[PDB]
Design a protein around this ligand. Structure first.
Ligand SMILES: Nc1ncnc2c1ncn2[C@@H]1O[C@H](COP(=O)(O)OP(=O)(O)O)[C@@H](O)[C@H]1O
Lengths: 231, 234, 240, 240, 256, 239, 220, 239
């Protein structure tokens, strides 16, 4: 082994962390994603574009669950995503072992944010390059949070991430409003993913995971197939 | 531009221990003379201001009851070496019921003189060599012995050595006035004669301190008001 | 468009890209070999050419067709030493899974463990990112044959038929047109397509002594390495 | 410029320049030749003196890992000794914790991974050694493997490592090593060494040979000094 | 190895620390917070850096962090790097409460967190904690206290503070417009609204970009309150009328 | 762990990082200190009152024990750590041999700690230079000065901070025997020495005295203003 | 050679303009910001042509203002124009005294800093008169204020002694910055000649201009 | 701008480590020692040097065990470290197996010891060079160690500054080394050593030391008292 143990994320003379902005620029060149929390549950949508028809779409997944009621999608680099998914799963299992209650989504967001912060600060390692989007229906009210590679977190009613996200943000501010239902939230999420997608939009391309008060459910290709028609 | 602490020179000697050799002559001078009836030491205090109390500055620090020392360089670095030498002398007395030879305590204090490391372990090991040269004088079992230690860890026996800023001038003035058959009062007078022209200030009974180790007298005497007996002769 | 140490250690560029994995990909096609995996209805086949430029070299220890477990096979591309280190790591992880969880480790979980191992190499800035490739084949009950490909950057994904090495682009361009008409993909069809892919990419019409073919199937799940007699039979059956 | 400092830094061309400089340091040594036969493995090392700097047998390059495993080195010395004690430790551990003798393939693989574990990080430097590993057993035949400082191990019917390597592999290719026994291949090895060595620039050459085989009933030992070693006289008879 | 080191320990050729000042410049923008006390009750005023319309706001928390029964803290600078410090000081307070079975005084908690912040600049080779936060609290020995902090571990007690955006004018107006020992908890809120009107460039600020949290003292309760948006609006309006009242002195006088 | 050399010898001979850290001391506030035959008087300067900041949390004079006082210079962040370590060492010495801590002993401890911080790897040197004033439990009082290099020296009149050379040159010929003959003359001498800097009077001086064998008493600024008033009144006659 | 050094704003060049009216021969002023060239080669050529013109004319005096911008150090030696500056100063070092030193040419050099200078310039034979410029605390500050307020009005209510009584950290560039701006409030308000509060708020704003945002709450 | 030659980890485009060559330049700056052997004896004669006029001469030969005796050229602290390693290994061998250690496995142990610092990061090569004489079970041996950890089983060789004259003398007077007694062998050693010196001064019985091991002779070191029987009977320098 070597054991560097020196932090290579230092302050710029202008007064900022340059590596955090570089990781955010890495996030901004990632896959597009959208997340909408509308009055009964949270809907997360993204884009799976393969470079060839020889890939297997159902092998890897992007709407990866954590518990029976918490879901996660991402925008950024794929290899730096399974690691924090596994860490969040292990941390939620530790919480369930200690307190004997399903983990509220907010505490999961703070602890994965603290994990990202200590990866930024500690020695010899680069920061993460993935922005998260964590959804869940705990204690009645749905919750939708986003954590950036800086290690912070916010809370959004409806947000977008990845490539071409400022126009998606204006779309979510204009077309959507405070009160929707679940199904028309799925409709407008499919529309705002279709504002930057390819010519075709099938269930092999888009992947949508919804949440509600009956638990987190990743949609089958059949449900996205009949949802994508005439929408 | 910047290299590690263990780096050899292109001509081959070293790149940090020679810098510790270069830091020797930024300190005060110190003269030790070995004679067949005793070992005499002398040093320059190098006062700066009249407000500073002159008795606080010490260079002659005793290690064992029969062994003296004299410094040249950075006193705070050599405090650790002198404390370690005290620990080794007491440990050898405790484990063998006899006093250390001055060669053995010089070897014990020179073993750890070159032990700096960056890849090394422990609770903060030395990261730079000590920048001091030490003179040791004693009467162990073969009689009067004087030793000199430099930051490369090399220790040798010297009959009459002077270290510090004007080490080469005091050595070249020590060449002519020395012989094997002399006495202690003559040695003190000759060392004070050498130290007369070396110092940039005027000599009195407060700018220097000297110490003599003999087979008869256990520790070293000649504090203040005993220096005035030989100062007025000079 | 660097930032001082952008070339050397694994850090983010101002453009967002991290350059050490992109320089490590050239280690895959530096070696000069090409390997094609083709999965059909009830079989998965691996074809890799081998180079023996000197007669004194043993021809039975050149082969990159490594065996991970008795039903899970693999092939490599790139530097040979990192490939063998990944081979030993994959064998150790398969044995550890078989000791821990009681049943046989699936192919996708082994690929996930390999990708998770390789991700820490590009996460930290003190190790070389280990530029070699990974192709695994196996059979999984109620899933049929499975073929997976891992990456030095830690990106694993499923496949239907894929190739790695130096000639990936032309082989995939031919293979897309081959797979676009979904015909009867039997055993003989799969070995014929896998051989003719390299035969049309390289245009060499190779002798049977320089081609290694590994097979796994549903009729028997054991990994088999084809000897020269069956390669002789398949090559004379290919020539009409 | 700056890519060639540490081993954990990939070049723009995808190479690792530290192991290339290690190979450059390897090829400055003297030639070591190993020939596999149908009944054993013969080594041969062209030791170089300067004026004396030695006795008869000094700066030995024929090591001895185990009873049946022979090791001949060529490269920067004192790393050959480190790898020799490493391979000795692997052989002793295998004997202690598995009962029977260590096979040559497993030992060569283990030492190859130990060599490869140094060309990954920036703290340590790659080795400057490229040795040979030959053995003979009744149940496994006679085997010979060669390991480079990059960490690649291949079997060989005959190979040469050192400065005059490209001028020595052709002379190995002249003979047919699959059929001869040990008693003529020792004089063939001596003839190859005498041909490949230049006396204008050095003029201070001296052979040393070795033996594993059924003639030494599965044990490694040096050819019996003044008895035999008249193959130098035979090679002087083949001066033209 | 060694050439890749970023050297976050050595001084500069003028002899002053060279990495802590960049963290202080990072604190020097991106945020605005202040605190006021001269009598019973001590207030914290903070500004929302992100006022985007798609935020839920249901998080029921802000830069104002509750950490004890009798304290509050407001952070400035990197929001990601302040959760670690708040959790650490909460752990320190709870360890004191476990040990001595009394609530922690303000001085000991502030000095403990400042020693923890100083330990990164002293050694370790890591980047310093780019967070400067501000504490309010109540104590048995000295009553209501307000404490400032720096990334270098320096700290100090205060009565009117400065931690956020461009506020040298705010420091000057806090010097000029402050009273000594006469600040009941209705004029200090108006003073905070008057200051935060001038620090922020948004003229006629609403109850979306301002957060007011007061620490008062009941009969042994130490009520920490976060003021809702229903009263902040008319608290702003009571100062909005004051500008029109103050402009009438130059209107009814210029008549001859 | 961060085992890496920070303090490295320069090519021209002198150490670099310690003489880098002397400028932190030299950019700090001034602090002077004298001793007499019955009383000792130490006084900091440049209090820098801001009219809205609490003055009890900005102090520069601390009590390591009942007989030891210390005033630092430079940055306070290292100073607080050194103060706490000195207090811990003093109480640990009192749990040993029952006599209270001698003033020289705590200076030797502080200098040894500073040296071991400069010598070892992966550690920045301290940026303070303390002034340790006290009377031991056998008679005569004394004051010492430390350094980031770790070279303690006993003095009779010292000054540190931005402007130490001017106060030292002023005290080069002012320390007579009649100036230390009484108690009020020593405080007047301290005020006259601190008047060479600051130059406001009675608002930037925080002088503290130890009376005799008694705990420290920080002077209330009313009698400090009285001392400044009589010092100004005694400097009116020139012809 | 005479070299003038000091704190940034003390007397540097100013004094150099005041000596260029009692002089008899012609005075040539060049600036170190001008002494870079984007074309590789016009650097040392301009230095050579500067001294050639000055030598043939008269017993002239050449004043290289801000010479510390170029000849600071040579240890970098990295490729680009940052080492070309080292090449364009070596000609100046050779043309100052390298072969057959020119008669009747007197050089004068103004710097801001000392320690970041090349020691081959610092050695004698090229510059000898090392001149130090300290900041006067109050005594000449009365005379600086006397000079700067001489060609303007002054009322009885405004007196300048108390504005500098507690402050001992100003400079002669700031005093002129005080006096130019204190006349600017009176013109912008169309008020009377000088008020005392004109000087009060001029001192506060010039302090804002001199010391604005230095992060020193921790006193080193 | 030099590059590749600041650490042992970095190789060169020519394929060598320059730090090892710098350690060789370090080891060729010490004084010249000569070690040689017969069929029944092993003698190493070393030349001491004076650092000053009145300072004593630094000794070179120092005993390791009852039969191993080493010389030195180069540094001194690393010399004491390596010599302590030889002493500890000889003690462990005599404690466990109750037999003398052979010199060949001893120098193999020291080669494996010295090869570890020249492969890791931040560890310098050992700047010493040893001439090891020993009488084990099968013949006397004289061995030479290098900072590259390439030990050579020499038969008669010299090390240090200006050792080429000694090497040429040992080459031209090689063959009659085993048939002679100890008295002629020692005179051969001093004749080899005196070619190092310039032709003005000689071996003045205060800058030379002779160490002998043998079949029945304990390893004895003679310096300035028993040397004088060997200096007599020596021919003058041909000049
Ligand atoms: N003693 C003084 N008398 C009059 N004016 C002064 C004095 N000192 C400084 N100044 C003013 O300060 C300004 C700065 O001068 P100088 O230091 O040479 O320029 P710079 O700061 O650009 O190098 C000058 O314009 C001058 O008018």
């Amino acid at each position: 082994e070597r054991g560097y143990s020196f932090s290579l994320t230092t302050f710029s003379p202008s007064g900022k962390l340059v590596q955090i902005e570089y990781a955010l620029a890495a996030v901004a060149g990632g896959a597009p994603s959208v997340g909408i929390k509308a009055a009964n549950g949270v809907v997360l949508a993204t884009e799976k574009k393969q470079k060839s028809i020889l890939y297997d779409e159902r092998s890897v997944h992007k709407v990866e669950p954590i518990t029976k009621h918490i879901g996660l999608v991402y925008s950024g680099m794929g290899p730096d995503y399974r690691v924090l998914v596994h860490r969040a799963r292990k941390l939620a299992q530790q919480y369930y072992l200690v307190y004997q209650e399903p983990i509220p989504t907010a505490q999961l967001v703070q602890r994965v944010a603290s994990v990202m912060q200590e990866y930024t600060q500690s020695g010899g390692v680069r920061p993460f390059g993935v922005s998260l989007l964590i959804c869940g229906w705990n204690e009645g009210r749905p919750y939708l949070f986003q954590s950036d590679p800086s290690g912070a977190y916010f809370a959004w009613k409806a947000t977008a991430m990845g490539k071409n996200y400022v126009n998606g943000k204006t779309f979510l501010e204009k077309r959507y409003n405070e009160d929707l239902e679940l199904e028309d939230a799925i409709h407008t999420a499919i529309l705002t993913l279709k504002e930057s997608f390819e010519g075709q939009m099938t269930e092999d391309n888009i992947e949508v995971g919804i949440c509600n008060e009956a638990g987190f459910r990743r949609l089958t290709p059949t449900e996205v197939k009949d949802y994508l028609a005439a929408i | 531009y910047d290299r590690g602490v263990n780096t050899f020179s292109p001509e081959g000697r070293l790149f940090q221990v020679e810098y510790a050799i270069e830091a020797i002559k930024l300190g005060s001078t110190a003269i030790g003379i070995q004679t067949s009836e005793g070992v005499c030491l002398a040093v320059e205090k190098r006062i700066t201001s009249p407000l500073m109390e002159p008795s606080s500055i010490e260079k002659i620090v005793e290690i064992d009851a029969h062994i003296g020392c004299a410094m040249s360089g950075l006193i705070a670095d050599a405090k650790t070496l002198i404390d370690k030498a005290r620990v080794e002398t007491q440990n050898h007395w405790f484990t063998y019921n006899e006093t250390m030879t001055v060669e053995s305590v010089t070897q014990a204090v020179s073993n750890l003189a070159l032990q700096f490391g960056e890849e090394d372990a422990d609770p903060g090991a030395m990261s730079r060599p000590f920048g001091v040269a030490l003179l040791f004088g004693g009467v162990d079992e073969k009689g009067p012995q004087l030793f000199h230690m430099d930051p490369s860890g090399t220790f040798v026996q010297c009959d009459a050595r002077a270290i510090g800023s004007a080490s080469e001038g005091a050595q070249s003035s020590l060449q002519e006035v020395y012989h094997k058959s002399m006495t202690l009062k003559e040695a003190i007078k000759s060392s004070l004669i050498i130290l007369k022209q070396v110092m940039e200030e005027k000599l009195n009974a407060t700018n220097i301190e000297l110490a003599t180790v003999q087979p008869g007298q256990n520790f070293h005497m000649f504090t203040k008001e005993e220096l005035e007996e030989v100062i007025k002769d000079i | 468009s660097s930032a001082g140490f952008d070339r050397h250690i694994t850090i983010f560029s101002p453009e967002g890209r991290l350059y050490q994995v992109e320089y490590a990909f050239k280690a895959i096609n530096q070696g000069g070999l090409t390997s094609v995996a083709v999965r059909g209805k009830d079989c998965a086949v691996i074809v890799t050419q081998k180079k023996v430029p000197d007669k004194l070299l043993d021809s039975s220890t050149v082969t990159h067709l490594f065996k991970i477990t008795e039903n899970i096979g693999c092939v490599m591309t790139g530097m040979t030493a990192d490939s063998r280190s990944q081979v030993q790591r994959a064998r150790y992880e398969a044995a550890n899974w078989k000791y821990k969880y009681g049943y046989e480790i699936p192919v996708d979980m082994l690929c996930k463990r390999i990708a998770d191992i390789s991700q820490v190499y590009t996460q930290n800035a003190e190790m070389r990112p280990l530029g070699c490739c990974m192709i695994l084949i196996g059979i999984d009950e109620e899933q049929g044959p499975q073929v997976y490909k891992c990456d030095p950057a830690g990106y694993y994904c499923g496949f239907k038929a894929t190739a790695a090495g130096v000639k990936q682009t032309e082989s995939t361009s031919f293979l897309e047109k081959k797979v676009k008409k979904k015909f009867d993909w039997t055993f003989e069809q799969t070995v014929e397509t896998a051989i003719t892919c390299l035969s049309t990419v390289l245009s060499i019409d190779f002798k049977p002594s320089e081609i290694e073919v590994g097979v796994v199937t549903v009729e028997n799940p054991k990994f088999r390495i084809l000897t020269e007699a069956e390669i002789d039979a398949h090559l004379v059956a290919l020539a009409e | 410029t700056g890519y060639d400092l540490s081993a954990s830094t990939f070049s723009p061309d995808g190479r690792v320049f530290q192991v290339e400089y290690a190979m450059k340091a390897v090829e400055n040594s003297s030639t070591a030749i190993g020939i596999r036969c149908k009944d054993g493995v013969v080594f041969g090392v062209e030791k170089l003196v300067l004026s004396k700097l030695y006795e008869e047998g000094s700066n030995k390059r024929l090591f001895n890992v185990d009873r049946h495993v022979g090791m001949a080195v060529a490269g920067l010395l004192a790393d050959a000794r480190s790898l020799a004690d490493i391979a000795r430790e692997e052989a002793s551990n295998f004997r202690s914790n598995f009962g029977y003798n260590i096979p040559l393939k497993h030992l060569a693989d283990r030492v190859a991974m130990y060599v490869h574990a140094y060309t990954l990080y920036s703290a340590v430097r790659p080795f400057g050694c490229s040795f040979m590993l030959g053995s003979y057993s009744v149940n496994d035949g006679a085997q010979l493997y060669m390991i480079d400082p990059s960490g690649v191990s291949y079997g060989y019917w005959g190979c040469a490592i050192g400065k005059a390597r490209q001028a020595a592999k052709t002379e190995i290719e002249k003979l047919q090593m699959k059929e001869m026994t040990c008693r003529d291949i020792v004089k063939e090895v001596a003839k190859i060494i005498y041909i490949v060595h230049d006396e204008v620039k050095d003029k201070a050459f001296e052979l040393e040979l070795s033996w594993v085989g059924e003639l030494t009933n599965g044990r490694h030992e040096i050819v019996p000094k003044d008895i035999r070693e008249e193959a130098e006289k035979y090679a002087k008879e083949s001066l033209k | 190895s060694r050439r890749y080191d970023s050297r976050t320990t050595i001084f500069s050729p003028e002899g002053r620390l060279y990495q802590v000042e960049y963290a202080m410049e990072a604190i020097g923008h991106a945020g605005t917070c202040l605190g006021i006390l001269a009598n019973d009750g001590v207030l914290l005023a903070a500004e929302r850096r992100n006022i985007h319309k798609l935020l839920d706001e249901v998080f029921f928390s802000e830069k104002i962090y509750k950490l004890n029964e009798d304290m509050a803290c407001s952070v400035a600078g990197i929001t990601s790097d302040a959760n670690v410090l708040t959790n650490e000081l909460r752990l320190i307070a709870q360890r004191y409460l476990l040990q001595y079975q009394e609530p922690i005084p303000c001085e000991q908690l502030v000095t403990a967190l400042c020693d923890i912040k100083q330990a990164y600049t002293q050694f370790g080779g890591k980047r310093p904690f780019g967070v400067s936060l501000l504490y309010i609290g109540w104590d048995k020995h000295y009553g209501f206290q307000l404490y400032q902090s720096d990334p270098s571990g320096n700290y100090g007690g205060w009565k009117a503070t400065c931690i956020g955006n461009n506020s040298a004018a705010a420091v000057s107006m806090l010097k000029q417009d402050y009273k000594e020992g006469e600040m009941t908890l209705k004029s200090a809120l108006a003073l905070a609204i008057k200051v935060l009107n001038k620090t922020m460039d948004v003229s006629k600020l609403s109850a979306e970009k301002v957060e007011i949290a007061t620490l008062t003292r009941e009969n042994g309760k130490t009520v920490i309150r976060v003021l809702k948006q229903k009263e902040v609006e008319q608290l702003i309006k009571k100062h909005e009328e004051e500008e029109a009242k103050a402009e009438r002195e130059k209107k009814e006088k210029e008549q001859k | 762990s961060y085992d890496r050399a920070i303090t490295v010898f320069s090519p021209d001979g002198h150490l670099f990082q310690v003489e880098y850290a002397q400028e932190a001391v030299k950019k700090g506030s001034t602090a002077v200190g004298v001793r007499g035959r019955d009383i000792v008087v130490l006084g900091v300067e440049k209090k820098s009152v801001a009219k809205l900041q609490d003055e009890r949390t900005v102090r520069k004079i601390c009590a390591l024990d009942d007989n030891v006082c210390m005033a630092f210079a430079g940055l306070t962040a290292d100073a607080r750590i050194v103060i706490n370590r000195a207090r811990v060492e003093c109480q640990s010495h009192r749990l040993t041999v029952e006599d209270p801590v001698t003033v020289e002993y705590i200076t030797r401890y502080i200098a040894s700690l500073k040296q071991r911080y400069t010598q070892s790897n992966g550690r920045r040197p301290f940026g303070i230079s303390a002034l340790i004033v006290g009377f031991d439990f056998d008679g005569t009082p004394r004051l010492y000065q430390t350094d980031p290099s770790g070279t303690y020296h006993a003095w009779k009149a010292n000054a540190i901070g931005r402007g130490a050379k001017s106060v030292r040159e002023f005290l080069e010929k002012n320390y007579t025997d009649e100036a230390i003959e009484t108690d009020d003359l020593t405080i007047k001498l301290v005020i006259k020495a601190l008047l060479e800097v600051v130059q406001s009077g009675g608002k930037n001086i925080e002088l503290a005295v130890m009376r005799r064998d008694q705990s420290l008493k920080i002077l209330n600024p009313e009698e400090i203003e009285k001392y400044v008033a009589e010092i100004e009144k005694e400097k009116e006659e020139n012809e | 050679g005479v070299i003038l050094y000091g704190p940034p704003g003390t007397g540097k060049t100013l004094l150099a303009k005041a000596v260029a009216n009692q002089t008899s021969a012609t005075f040539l002023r060049v600036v170190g910001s001008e002494l870079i060239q984007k074309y590789l080669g016009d650097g040392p050529k301009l230095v050579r042509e500067l001294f050639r013109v000055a030598e043939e004319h008269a017993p002239s005096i050449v004043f290289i203002d801000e010479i510390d911008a170029i000849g600071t150090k040579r240890y970098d030696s990295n490729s680009g124009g940052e080492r070309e500056i080292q090449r364009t100063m070596l000609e100046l070092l050779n043309q100052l005294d390298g072969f057959d030193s020119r008669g009747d040419v007197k050089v004068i050099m103004a710097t801001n800093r000392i320690e970041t200078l090349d020691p081959a310039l610092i050695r004698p034979g090229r510059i000898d008169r090392k001149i130090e410029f300290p900041l006067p605390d109050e005594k000449t500050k009365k005379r600086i204020f006397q000079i700067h307020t001489s060609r303007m009005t002054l009322a009885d209510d405004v007196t300048l002694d108390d504005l500098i009584m507690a402050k001992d950290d100003l400079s002669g560039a700031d005093i002129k910055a005080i006096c130019t701006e204190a006349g600017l409030m009176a013109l912008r308000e169309r008020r009377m000649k000088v008020t005392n509060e004109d000087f009060k708020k001029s001192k506060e704003n010039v302090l804002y201009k001199k010391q604005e945002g230095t992060p020193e709450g921790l006193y080193l | 701008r030099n590059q590749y030659d600041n650490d042992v980890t970095v190789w060169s485009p020519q394929g060598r480590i320059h730090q090892i060559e710098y350690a060789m330049e370090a080891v060729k700056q010490g004084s010249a020692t000569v070690g040689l052997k017969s069929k029944t004896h092993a003698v190493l004669v070393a030349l001491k040097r004076a650092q000053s006029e009145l300072a004593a001469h630094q000794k070179k030969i120092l005993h390791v065990d009852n039969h191993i005796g080493i010389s030195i050229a180069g540094l001194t602290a690393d010399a004491r470290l390596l010599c302590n390693f030889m002493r500890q290994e000889c003690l462990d061998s005599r404690f466990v197996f109750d037999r003398p250690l052979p010199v060949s496995r001893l120098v193999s142990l020291i080669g494996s010891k010295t090869q570890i610092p020249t492969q890791r990061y931040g560890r310098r090569p050992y700047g010493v060079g040893l001439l090891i004489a020993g009488y084990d079970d099968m013949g006397p041996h004289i061995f030479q160690t290098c900072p590259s950890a390439n030990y050579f089983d020499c038969r008669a060789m010299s090390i240090g500054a200006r050792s080429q004259s000694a090497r040429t003398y040992l080459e031209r007077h090689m063959s009659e080394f085993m048939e002679c007694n100890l008295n002629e062998l020692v005179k051969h050693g001093l004749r080899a050593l005196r070619e190092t010196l310039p032709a003005e001064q000689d071996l003045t019985t205060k800058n030379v030391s002779i160490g002998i091991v043998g079949k029945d002779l304990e390893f004895t070191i003679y310096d300035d008292d028993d040397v004088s029987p060997f200096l007599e009977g020596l021919e003058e320098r041909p000049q």
